[PDB]
């Protein structure tokens, strides 16, 4: 009658197993102790359910305490080490000014659980009373009441966990709440011991419960473990690659160079008017983006972009904040508050899709990437700034990838992606088919130089690039150009700077140039008098020889990091400085 194994196993039996494992020296011994607990569970299960029919009961109530980091059903506990300290100080009735109280309070980073254990052990002699199931009920209570900001009920659930458990169970309970058990055995090892297929399964369903239920019998595997509709799969990952080796790395055959967006990795699951969104760690973001075309920040706007033949699909991409007025994606690192601006409709959510894993009743994971891309084009018609196919192009040249990387950094992207056209989709696997390339930046990151010129181009107009200079050391009235740098308004402060500078630009005349600003072959469309301009902080990979600038050199992969409006124009970097820097 709805019976469960967890309802018969003392949490104490779980914690003694954990203790034995943690205290065990070698991998083999650690594994042994786990197999022993597991096997008892499985044999008891068979006994408990021999007569029972169609049972959903499994190792899950234990599994989730053993791998607390993978809990997805329960929301956050919201319990601080310092909050426990206080509860424990009051409850154990410690001298409020004594070493024990203070050691719990002033705890920083011996985990807290151990410090707590050594205070508890002399004082808390009770034998434990709770089943694994009851521990789960109480943890559920904490999470649920956390979500509701019902602090008092939270205390009461905790007080039932503590006063009902032994000292040793509390040490483990604390680790289960912090979600760091410190067993000295990887979660990969845990899955391997549980079932040959546990890890593969977990990668395409970020769900311990399904993993435990479906693989409850060790001696029967699953085949064609695959991405399935409404199951969070772990994203495929890009490995770092040095530019020098790329041609080899892409197997000396054609490859894709795709835009690298720094957003939130999000997967979209679609069946009709029903949508689910999962983040990279397998959390549900459907409340924000929209379950149905009538709800949320995205779904109502993209629902009708899906072509007529499309009833079911699974997409992988990045959520970006798009600025409609400048047609620009906003970078994560800004002084400004992106989520609020998206909620205030100053920015909007844009889904940039680079992959598709299922279309209708058809699984795509084991298709060539090239085939997947073809299919992607058929999935939906893009709407700029809401749902888009990430831009890609074919290439086979190390040369072509530097071009890509140069233009990427120029447009204030932070790198590029390189992908094998024949590669298949491999959940949670890093590298393999996908590489990422970024500049080799050298910590040179604090180049503070003056804006002396600008270039109009794409976007609202607003400027696409700045020309920057260093100061000639005065006995500052003369500057020497050093580099063009991308100006795109990927952060509002660059946009605000533009409005600040607007009234100061002056037409640059090659045949009658200003004296305060000395140029190489690179001339700006407009310039600005130095006393009217602003220092920007520039990150660069290196300084290289160049006749385009007066300094006789320029910056490789430059990028504005900060607007240093906290420094007067005359605080500019000098040639003398730059010379010293090159060494």
């Amino acid at each position: 009658t709805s019976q469960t194994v967890a309802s018969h196993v003392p949490f104490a039996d779980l914690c003694s197993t954990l203790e034995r494992i943690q205290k065990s020296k070698g991998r083999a011994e650690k594994i042994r102790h786990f197999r022993e607990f597991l096997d008892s569970w499985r044999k008891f299960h068979d006994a408990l359910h021999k007569n029972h029919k169609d049972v959903t009961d499994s190792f899950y109530p234990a599994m989730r305490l053993i791998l607390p980091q993978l809990e997805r059903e329960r929301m956050a506990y919201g319990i601080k080490e310092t909050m426990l300290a206080k509860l424990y100080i009051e409850l154990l009735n410690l001298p409020r000014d004594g070493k024990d109280a203070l050691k719990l309070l002033n705890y920083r980073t011996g985990d807290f659980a151990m410090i707590a254990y050594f205070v508890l052990k002399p004082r808390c002699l009770q034998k434990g009373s709770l089943t694994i199931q009851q521990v789960n009920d109480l943890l559920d209570s904490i999470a649920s009441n956390n979500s509701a900001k019902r602090k008092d009920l939270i205390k009461k659930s905790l007080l039932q966990l503590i006063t009902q458990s032994s000292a040793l169970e509390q040490k483990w309970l604390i680790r289960m709440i912090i979600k760091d058990l410190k067993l000295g055995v990887s979660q990969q090892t845990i899955f391997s011991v549980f079932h040959n297929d546990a890890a593969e399964l977990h990668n395409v369903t970020t769900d311990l419960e399904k993993v435990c239920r479906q693989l409850h019998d060790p001696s029967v595997g699953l085949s064609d473990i695959s991405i399935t509709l409404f199951s969070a799969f772990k994203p495929m990952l890009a490995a770092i690659a040095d530019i020098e080796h790329i041609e080899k790395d892409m197997k000396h055959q054609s490859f894709y160079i795709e835009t690298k967006l720094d957003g939130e990795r999000m997967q979209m699951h679609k069946d009709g008017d029903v949508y689910k969104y999962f983040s990279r760690n397998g959390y549900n973001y459907t409340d924000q983006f929209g379950a149905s075309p009538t709800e949320g920040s995205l779904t109502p706007f993209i629902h009708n972009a899906f072509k007529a033949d499309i009833q079911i699909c699974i997409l992988d991409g990045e959520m970006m904040a798009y600025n409609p007025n400048t047609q620009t994606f906003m970078q994560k690192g800004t002084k400004f508050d992106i989520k609020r601006m998206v909620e205030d409709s100053d920015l909007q959510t844009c889904y940039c899709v680079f992959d598709v894993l299922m279309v209708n009743n058809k699984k795509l994971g084991h298709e060539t990437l090239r085939k997947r891309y073809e299919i992607l084009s058929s999935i939906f018609t893009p709407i700029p700034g809401r749902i888009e196919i990430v831009q890609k192009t074919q290439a086979h040249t190390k040369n072509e990838v530097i071009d890509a990387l140069n233009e990427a950094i120029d447009k204030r992207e932070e790198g590029i992606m390189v992908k094998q056209p024949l590669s298949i989709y491999k959940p949670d696997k890093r590298g393999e088919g996908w590489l990422k390339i970024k500049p080799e930046y050298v910590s040179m990151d604090e180049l503070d130089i003056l804006i002396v010129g600008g270039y109009w181009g794409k976007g609202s107009g607003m400027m696409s690039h700045f020309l920057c200079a260093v100061a000639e050391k005065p006995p500052p009235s003369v500057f020497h150009t050093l580099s063009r740098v991308g100006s795109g308004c990927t952060m509002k402060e660059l946009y605000d700077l533009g409005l600040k500078l607007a009234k100061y630009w002056k037409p640059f005349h090659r045949k009658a140039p200003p004296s305060s600003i000395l140029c190489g072959t690179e001339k700006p469309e407009v310039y600005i008098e130095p006393c009217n301009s602003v220092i920007v902080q520039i990150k660069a990979a290196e300084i290289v020889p160049s006749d385009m600038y007066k300094t006789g050199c320029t910056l490789r992969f430059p990028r504005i990091e900060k607007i240093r409006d906290d420094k007067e124009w005359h605080e500019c970097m000098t040639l003398d400085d730059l010379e010293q820097l090159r060494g």
Binding site: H8, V9, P10, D13, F37, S40, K43, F44, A47, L48
Partner: peptide, 10 residues
């Protein structure tokens, strides 16, 4: 009804 104590501590 199978009892847990004999499956674990055995």
């Amino acid at each position: 009804v199978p009892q847990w104590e004999v499956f674990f501590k055995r």
